[PDB]
């Protein structure tokens, strides 16, 4: 209930019953209670794969190995054609149970046999903790794809290019820079308009 | 069923036909007749709608700036504009073939661009643009302004900022602000832009948003303005050896009064336009303090209307009680507005072909043609709207007891005289004009062309001699060297005007003869006829003798059936409906005439016009037939060239037009029976009786089909003529 801009409203179906509910849905996508049931696991799985991708994207660029946007380009691995067909069967098999175990139980688990908890670890109020970590990680992944972009160096290399350095080389002193200033100025003045929508009711 | 669409009219969203869709599209902007419509709500909706319209206008202009700046070649056009053609925008059509794109790539571009026959390039070159960057800045600015207007339109609907009814209907406070602010201050600021930017850009300089605060517009600067030495702003103006975009023969003056044209660019001087906007800025700002606001000295419009009733009672009550009908009704104000705007539009066209303001206009000829034709047709439609809203005023908003004895009731008292005399002049012009044309045709067809009537238009030639055209040997008032007017104006503003009026190469006061006599009478026939139809429709809207309670039906009702001999097309709507055809015809005559006279001017042989303009075969053979040679050769079994798109549009127009005849000639019930048999067929067909209509199919109603037929007629007419004009003029000179 700390809203996404300090003094805000709550859209009329984002009450405090969801986990990460900071009351942000301006385009009215999830107006159903049937797509919320689905967008929640879209949120969790889209975030979850990215959480598992950030570790790899950092280690491959800390240890050595060639940069990720050209990872599979050159490949000492085996038979580019058919190992994707290996990457179809096991996955579709696994998807059968992911969607099936999504259907038969309520909106939480996925693995083949049960809601997967071989430990006695947290199945508690801290699912908001990992969906929070996930929605941090998704934003972290786009940044790396924008580093395979404009600068062309990896994460940790540009981390050295600016992050021991002053604010002389950052967004606004770079190729895609005049648009970000406009978007910052526009997004910042936007809750000042949303307040004007609901001040005059 | 009781469907949602549309919510403004409950009786309309009730029937199970397809009439509800068309009528819901048709009665949306008829705010006065929705469900639960008060008067305050009406004014507020109209206000917000105005904001919507402003948003669309500014967004559109931003679009033009953006496409010109991105896909055009304005940076290269400003170096040599008697050369490389303007570029409107670029094409990406996946339907093209190889020679198509190979053909359209013209004007120095790298892909399929098409030429800009709009005159935006000359406008933006005159006002002071020079590069692309400035155009982009303008586009961003105008898009931002459009967003502001859209937001305001949303704002003033919110229930705390909704203006009350009496904030509207405040005449005296709206005219002071419009006349002073909206006209005067805008004109003064435009003078500011001309003086600061447009002139020094025409001297050779880049006065931008950078360093306009540190550049003297005149090398003395606000000393003579505060001393009273104003004629020191006019000393040493731009030499007649001027080159526009450089500093060659550059003067120093900022406010002159020369007249004439620029000797190298064939436009008006910029200094004259600065001085003009300055002068009328002063006039409008002074005129904005006439009426009364929350202060002392103002006027009341009701007193002014009350006191102007003449003695002896040649008018009954004069203008008593008009102020409570101009203020209380919207269709009256809208009628006046459309009338004024239409006449002003015509004036815009008439002055912009003859006195071209923009640099290197009138050397791009397609620009002249398209601009003048465009504004003429726009003026026609606007004037027709004015009379239509007159008729709606009489039916909906007129009240007799409030208007007992003013001029408005007097006009309803003697309307048969008006309609009779309009009928008379229409008949007179028709008989004699058509007769003289047919007589000249017969004489030309037989071997004797000297046996025909060629009346010399001596009145207009008298006037042209009065303005200074020293060719007709009349010698008076501006053509005589010893006149008072000639000698008084001689020292400062005549010698430009005389050199511009005795040139036989510009459009200023073209030489005229008998063909012009005949065509001007044809034009007068058009105006009197169209006025006849419209005025008859307006004044007979309260009722006729065929039907004395037409006011109980509203504006647009179908008929009254077969009784009393049958009354088809009796509504005022149908009178205007008939008038639209005349508008299209009359503008057709003026535009054919203008176009051919300027084609013969730009080619070189005015003799062809002055000989072949006096008999209708001359028009058919020497204008419609000869000039459509490069058009219809836009594509053939041998190839295609630039004007293939025009040669396809040219047939497109005909197709729409001929479809237009169908809704006019063949009226309804036949189609009703046909559609009913279709309903049977789709109902009993096996394997396709699994899909039904939700709303029953019916034929178009009697009123609607008239509008649809007129839409096709007008659209096909416009597309055909535009195609011919652009293709012919740009094929020859372009």
């Amino acid at each position: 209930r700390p809203m996404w801009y300090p003094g805000a409203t709550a859209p009329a179906h984002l009450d405090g019953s969801m986990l990460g509910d900071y009351g942000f849905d301006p385009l009215r996508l999830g107006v159903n209670k049937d797509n919320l049931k689905w967008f929640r696991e879209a949120e969790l799985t889209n975030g979850r794969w990215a959480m598992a991708a950030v570790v790899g994207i950092l280690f491959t660029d800390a240890v050595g190995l060639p940069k990720f946007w050209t990872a599979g380009a050159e490949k000492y691995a085996l038979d580019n054609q058919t190992l994707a067909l290996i990457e179809v069967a096991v996955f579709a098999v696994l998807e059968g149970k992911r969607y099936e175990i999504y259907k038969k139980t309520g909106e939480t688990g996925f693995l083949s046999f049960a809601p997967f908890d071989p430990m006695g670890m947290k199945s508690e109020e801290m699912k908001l903790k990992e969906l929070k970590n996930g929605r941090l990680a998704m934003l972290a992944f786009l940044g790396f794809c924008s580093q395979a972009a404009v600068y062309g160096k990896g994460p940790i290399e540009t981390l050295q290019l600016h992050l021991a350095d002053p604010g002389h080389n950052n967004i606004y002193t770079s190729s895609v820079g005049p648009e970000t200033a406009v978007t910052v100025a526009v997004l910042c003045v936007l809750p000042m308009i949303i307040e004007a929508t609901k001040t005059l009711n | 069923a009781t469907k949602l669409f549309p919510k403004f009219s409950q009786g309309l969203a009730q029937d199970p036909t397809t009439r509800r869709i068309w009528y819901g599209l048709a009665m949306a902007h008829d705010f006065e007749s929705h469900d639960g419509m008060t008067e305050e709500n009406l004014y507020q909706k109209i206000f917000a709608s105005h904001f919507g319209q402003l948003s669309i206008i500014f967004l559109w202009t931003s679009g033009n700036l953006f496409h010109v700046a991105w896909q055009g070649n304005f940076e290269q056009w400003v170096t040599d504009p008697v050369h490389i053609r303007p570029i409107a925008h670029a094409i990406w059509d996946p339907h093209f073939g190889q020679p198509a794109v190979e053909a359209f790539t013209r004007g120095g571009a790298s892909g399929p661009v098409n030429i800009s026959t709009s005159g935006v390039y000359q406008w933006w070159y005159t006002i002071g643009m020079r590069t692309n960057q400035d155009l982009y800045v303008g586009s961003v600015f105008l898009a931002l302004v459009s967003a502001i207007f859209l937001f305001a339109g949303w704002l003033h609907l919110q229930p705390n900022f909704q203006p009350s009814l009496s904030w509207f209907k405040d005449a005296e406070s709206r005219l002071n602000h419009h006349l002073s602010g909206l006209f005067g201050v805008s004109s003064l600021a435009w003078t500011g832009h001309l003086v600061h930017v447009a002139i020094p850009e025409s001297r050779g300089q880049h006065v931008g948003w950078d360093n306009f605060l540190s550049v003297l517009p005149h090398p003395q600067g606000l000393t003579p303005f505060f001393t009273g030495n104003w004629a020191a702003y006019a000393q040493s103006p731009d030499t007649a050896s001027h080159v526009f975009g450089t500093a060659q023969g550059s003067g120093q003056a900022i406010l002159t009064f020369l007249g004439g044209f620029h000797p190298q660019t064939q436009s008006l001087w910029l200094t004259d336009m600065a001085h003009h906007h300055l002068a009328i800025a002063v006039i409008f700002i002074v005129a904005g303090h006439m009426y009364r606001t929350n202060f002392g000295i103002g006027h009341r419009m009701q007193a002014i209307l009350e006191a102007h009733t003449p003695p002896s009672g040649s008018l009954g009550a004069g203008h008593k009680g008009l102020f409570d009908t101009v203020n209380n009704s919207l269709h009256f104000q809208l009628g006046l507005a459309l009338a004024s705007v239409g006449t002003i539009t015509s004036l815009v066209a008439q002055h912009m072909y003859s006195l071209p303001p923009y640099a290197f206009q009138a050397i791009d000829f397609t620009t002249q043609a398209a601009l003048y034709t465009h504004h003429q047709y726009i003026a026609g439609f606007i004037m027709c709207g004015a009379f239509a809203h007159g008729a709606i005023f009489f039916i909906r908003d007129y009240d007799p007891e409030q208007n007992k004895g003013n001029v408005l009731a007097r006009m309803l008292d003697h309307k048969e005289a008006l309609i009779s005399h309009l009928s008379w002049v229409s008949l007179f012009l028709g008989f004699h004009t058509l007769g003289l044309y047919v007589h000249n045709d017969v004489m030309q067809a037989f071997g004797t062309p000297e046996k025909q009537i060629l009346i010399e238009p001596v009145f207009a030639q008298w006037i042209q001699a009065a303005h200074g055209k020293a060719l007709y040997g009349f010698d008076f008032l501006l053509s005589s060297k010893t006149s008072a007017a000639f000698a008084n104006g001689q020292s400062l503003w005549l010698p430009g005007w005389l050199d511009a009026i005795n040139n036989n190469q510009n459009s200023l006061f073209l030489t005229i003869g008998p063909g012009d006599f005949l065509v001007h009478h044809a034009i007068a026939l058009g105006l009197h006829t169209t006025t006849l139809i419209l005025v008859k429709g307006a004044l007979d809207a309260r009722g006729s003798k065929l039907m004395p309670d037409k006011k109980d039906f509203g504006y647009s009702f179908p008929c009254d059936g077969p009784g009393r001999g049958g009354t088809c097309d009796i509504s005022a709507y149908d009178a205007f409906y008939l008038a639209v055809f005349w508008m299209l015809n009359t503008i057709g005559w003026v535009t054919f005439y203008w176009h051919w006279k300027h084609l013969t001017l730009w080619q070189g042989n005015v003799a062809q016009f002055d000989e072949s303009s006096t008999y209708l075969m001359g028009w058919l053979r020497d204008y419609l037939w000869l000039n459509s040679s490069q058009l219809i050769n836009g594509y053939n079994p041998f190839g295609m060239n630039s004007l293939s798109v025009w040669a396809w549009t040219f047939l497109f127009g005909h197709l729409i037009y001929a479809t237009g005849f169908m809704f006019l000639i063949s009226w309804r019930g036949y189609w009703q029976e046909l559609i009913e048999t279709l309903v049977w067929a789709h109902e009993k067909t096996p394997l396709a009786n699994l899909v039904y209509w939700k709303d029953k199919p019916v034929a178009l109603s009697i009123v609607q089909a008239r509008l649809v037929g007129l839409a096709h007629f007008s659209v096909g007419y416009i597309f055909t003529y535009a195609a011919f004009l652009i293709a012919s003029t740009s094929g020859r000179f372009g």
Binding site: - | P163, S164, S166, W167, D170, S173, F226, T227, G228, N229, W230, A231, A232, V286, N294, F295, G296, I297, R300, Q302, A303, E306
Partner: protein, 91 residues
């Protein structure tokens, strides 16, 4: 050719001619109550930006507010600068 003499004398002349002789004839047109005294019978905002709010007090024996001064001085300035401007084009 002094601008101060032309403008000052102009505004003085027009303020005088508005002070002494054209006062009552301007005050005979204050009576519009025969036709309009309720310009707007309104209650709130959007009606009192249209109705009178303030009355400019005059201890002037005849009653010139600042508005009449502004008007006659404005005409005086217009005419004075017209005189200087017609004088401006080399006589």
């Amino acid at each position: 050719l002094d601008p101060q003499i032309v403008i000052s004398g102009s505004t003085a002349a027009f303020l005088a001619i508005g002070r002494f002789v054209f006062l009552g004839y301007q005050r005979r047109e204050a009576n519009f109550d025969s036709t309009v005294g309720p310009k707007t019978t309104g209650a709130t905002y959007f009606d009192d930006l249209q109705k009178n709010s303030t009355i400019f007090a005059t201890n002037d024996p005849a009653g010139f507010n600042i508005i009449d001064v502004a008007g006659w001085g404005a005409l005086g300035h217009a005419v004075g600068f017209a005189v200087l401007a017609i004088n401006s084009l080399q006589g």
